[PDB]
Amino acid sequence: EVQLVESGGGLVQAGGSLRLSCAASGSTFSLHVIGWYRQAPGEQREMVAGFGTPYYPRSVKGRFTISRDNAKDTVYLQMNSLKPDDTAVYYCNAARSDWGQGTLVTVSSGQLVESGGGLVQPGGSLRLSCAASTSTFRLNSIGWFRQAPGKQRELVATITADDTTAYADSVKGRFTISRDNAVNTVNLQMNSLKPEDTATYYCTARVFIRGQGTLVTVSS
């Protein structure tokens, strides 16, 4: 088989920009010039970029831009002027000629510290919670990152100043998120963990700031 890996998932405020990345490896020649795809929970799979000359949907035309690098097996997507319809898990390409883990991207519609962590089997019913300077109106766009030592940042869940929730395909159905309106903290369920999930977890992403980071392991 051929392997695809997406990376670059961010939670951003509207009008912001991103670069998605997709690194490939497989059994055939070093360059295959092909595209990008996405999915939001209220939507099916959708083409984002690709093909013999490049193509973009009307919904992203002029905003998203594909590019490629040949020395390092990476294909990219500049994404300018992000919008709350662009909150989606972005996927790279058909496996051969009809498949990656999926990278969550979220766009928000409107002294850091975390708690929880530990060691688990066979997984579920945890109380990770993120908690800093709770009282004074600090309630901002938020989500939980995770990182294992080799591979890069992966966004798994998101919340914001409103109770609206979205997840990564890596965790969909298994993770779950909520926020307390009096304690002003956000919680992560972490149901039915799998060894692939062992990572240190972080709570924040962008400027007005990093988390403490807390390790979850599941060894059994």
Question: What pairing do the DSSP bridges indicate for beta strands 118-119 and 214-217?
Answer: parallel
Closest Cα partner for 178 from 195, 197, 191? 191
The region that residue 81 occupies, defined by phi over 0 for left and psi between -120 and 50 for alpha, beta otherwise, is left
The reply to whether omega before 122 is within 30° of 0 (cis) is yes
Please choose, from the candidates 184, 174, 171, the residue with its C-alpha nearest in 3D space to the C-alpha of residue 142.
184
Q: Which domains does the chain carry?
A: 3-107 (2.60.40.10), 110-214 (2.60.40.10)
**Strands, sheet with 74-79, edge to edge from the N-terminal-most edge strand:** 3-7, 18-25, 74-79, 64-69
Resolution (A): 2.8
Distance CA(104)–CA(36), nearest Å, equals 14
CA atoms of 156 and 4, how far apart (whole Å): 18
Handedness of CA 103, 185, 165, 14 (dihedral sign): negative
Candidates 95, 126, 142; CA nearest to 192 is: 126
Give 165-174's long-range contacts (Cβ < 8 A, gap of 24+).
Answer: 166/40, 166/41, 166/87, 166/104, 166/106, 167/104, 168/9, 168/89, 168/102, 168/103, 168/104, 169/89, 169/101, 169/102, 169/104, 170/101, 170/102, 170/196, 171/197
Interatomic CA distance for residues 193 and 104, integer angstroms: 19
User: Is-contact 175 123, C-beta < 8 A?
Assistant: no
